[PDB]
Amino acid sequence: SQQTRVLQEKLRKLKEAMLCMVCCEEEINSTFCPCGHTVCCESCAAQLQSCPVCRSRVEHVQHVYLPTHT
Amino acid sequence: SQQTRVLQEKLRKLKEAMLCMVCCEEEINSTFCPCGHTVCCESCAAQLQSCPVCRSRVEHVQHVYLPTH
Ligand SMILES: CC(=O)Nc1ccc(Nc2ccccc2)cc1
Ligand SMILES: [Zn+2]
Ligand SMILES: [Zn+2]
Ligand SMILES: [Zn+2]
Ligand SMILES: [Zn+2]
Numbered sequence: 001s002q003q004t005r006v007l008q009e010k011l012r013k014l015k016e017a018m019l020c021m022v023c024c025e026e027e028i029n030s031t032f033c034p035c036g037h038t039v040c041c042e043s044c045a046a047q048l049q050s051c052p053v054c055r056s057r058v059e060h061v062q063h064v065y066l067p068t069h070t
Numbered sequence: 071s072q073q074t075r076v077l078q079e080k081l082r083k084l085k086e087a088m089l090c091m092v093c094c095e096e097e098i099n100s101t102f103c104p105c106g107h108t109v110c111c112e113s114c115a116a117q118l119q120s121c122p123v124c125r126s127r128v129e130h131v132q133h134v135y136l137p138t139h
Binding site for chain 2: 001003004007008010011014015017018021031033034036039053062064067068
């Protein structure tokens with residue numbers, strides 16, 4: 001039904017929000033510290049000097065294990 | 071249809087996986103450092119000396135800003 005199409009769209013949007021903001025291909029699994037923005041996969045987070053969201057200096061990257069990881 | 075029920079269940083499970091594993095009421099927004107397990111809201115994470123997933127000592131809690139929030 002049309003309700004099935006609405007639910008498919010909600011699911012797709014939630015899944016796309018879990019993907020890296022730089023490569024759009026890999027799941028987010030890394031946090032820029034100390035700001036806390038968690039928006040990249042490990043590879044894209046590795047060479048950024050400043051956070052791509054808030055411009056704060058990246059002192060280090062913390063790996064995150066999330067229950068939504070697939 | 072039956073597919074509407076199946077999709078409602080998938081959405082419910084994905085939403086529940088984003089909720090705190092301790093209180094089941096608030097969104098996950100905190101990481102136990104250094105282990106990296108990110109399974110609690112800030113209120114439950116503040117009260118745990120050891121990670122509830124791996125039992126490693128919590129040196130500190132890092133707040134996480136996620137796009138799904
Ligand atoms: C099997 C056992 O004794 N404990 C155990 C170990 C790893 C996970 N993995 C995991 C948890 C939360 C978030 C992302 C991954 C869950 C439970
Ligand atoms: Zn990436
Ligand atoms: Zn930031
Ligand atoms: Zn909680
Ligand atoms: Zn842990």
